[PDB]
Design a protein around this ligand. Structure first.
Ligand code: XJ4
Length: 333
């Protein structure tokens, strides 16, 4: 139902084009595959959620002997057209359906995919990627191999105030004669439930990031149903902490070289941008204080996660929580 919409979203060539036009994304995948040609020459490769098939062609440019491209949306029909018109019907085989349901005729030497949603984990496609390892030969590789999530406290008073400014629409005792003000708190709540997807100046960050690593070769599908990310930040600056910023890097660890794709705010912008989660109430922290807590991600049935963030300044005991709905963010860009 929710999944109906998820796969229809990816049936649009315009959504494929948005990702293809991300040059950092598309070019880094090309370079990771090509410059690791020994991982692909004459190999059998599985492309999980191939969309238009761009990754499958990159594996063919690298010399792969057979490429199974699995795609569940109507986009599979468009990739088929592309395979024929590029004369690769020998080397690339499009398989319509979910990776969890299709039948592959052999095991593969390497799995390739672009399974990262914003904040990495949205869409829960990492689980389909991990599930595909049931087709991975022993000692096969995964491209990408590693994913690092980073989180860091930020201060951004204008972003925080923007929330009450939008919800104060409801604080009118006479909107065309109607008292709206009893909904103001519900409206505040609704805005704070949304992660804020856009980029930002790195001068809002107040501590070195915490890194949480998922190893795609080692992880199991079940390991992503619940992601506990403890953190303890040593605050490099004093200020009001308004929430946590998130970005992610992935690594393609090939035989020839390791290529990184970063969505860090210190790196060229990508179509993933970065993600920020506001706290209920900001926390005052001195430089030298430690800010500790947990960011808990609980998979849900809308192909996404409920996000629970609890934090406290250890030196004073002031704490804040928040609960966010990652499926429904504010695309502030
Ligand atoms: C698996 N590799 C995906 C790589 N791209 C990740 C990515 C990066 C940046 C943004 C989105 C994004 N944009 C959406 N609309 C939209 C955003 C801005 C302007 C106009 C429309 C939606 C609806 C979703 C989405 C999906 C899918 N499922 O739930 C949700 C929510 N995601 C996705």
């Amino acid at each position: 139902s929710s999944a109906v919409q998820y796969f229809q979203f990816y049936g649009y060539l315009s959504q494929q084009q948005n990702m293809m036009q991300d040059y950092v994304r598309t070019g880094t995948y090309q370079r990771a595959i090509l410059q690791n040609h020994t991982d692909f020459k004459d190999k059998i490769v599985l492309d999980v959620g191939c969309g238009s098939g761009i990754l499958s062609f990159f594996a063919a440019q690298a010399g792969a002997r057979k490429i199974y491209a699995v795609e569940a949306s109507t986009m599979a029909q468009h990739a088929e057209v592309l395979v024929k018109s590029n004369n690769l019907t020998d080397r690339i085989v499009v398989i319509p359906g979910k990776v969890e349901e299709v039948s592959l005729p052999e095991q593969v030497d390497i799995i390739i995919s672009e399974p990262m949603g914003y904040m990495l984990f949205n869409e829960r496609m990492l689980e389909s990627y991990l599930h595909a390892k049931k087709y991975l030969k022993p000692s096969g590789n995964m491209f990408p191999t590693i994913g690092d999530v980073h989180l860091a406290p930020f201060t951004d008073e204008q972003l925080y105030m923007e929330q009450f400014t939008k919800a104060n629409f409801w604080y009118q005792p006479s909107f065309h004669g109607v008292d709206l003000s009893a909904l103001r708190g519900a409206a505040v709540d609704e805005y704070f439930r949304q992660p804020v997807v856009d980029t930002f100046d790195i001068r809002i960050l107040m501590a070195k990031s915490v890194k949480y690593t998922v190893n795609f070769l080692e992880a199991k599908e079940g390991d992503l149903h619940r992601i506990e990310i403890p953190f303890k930040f040593h605050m490099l600056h004093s200020g009001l902490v308004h929430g946590l910023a998130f970005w992610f890097d992935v690594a393609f660890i090939g035989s020839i070289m390791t290529v990184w794709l970063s969505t860090a705010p210190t790196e060229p912008l990508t179509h993933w941008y970065q993600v920020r989660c506001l706290f209920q109430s900001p926390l005052f922290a001195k430089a030298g204080d430690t800010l500790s807590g947990t960011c808990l991600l609980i998979a849900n049935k809308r192909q996404s996660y409920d996000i629970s963030i609890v934090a406290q300044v250890d030196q004073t005991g002031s704490k804040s929580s928040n609960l966010l709905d990652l499926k429904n963010p504010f695309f502030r860009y």
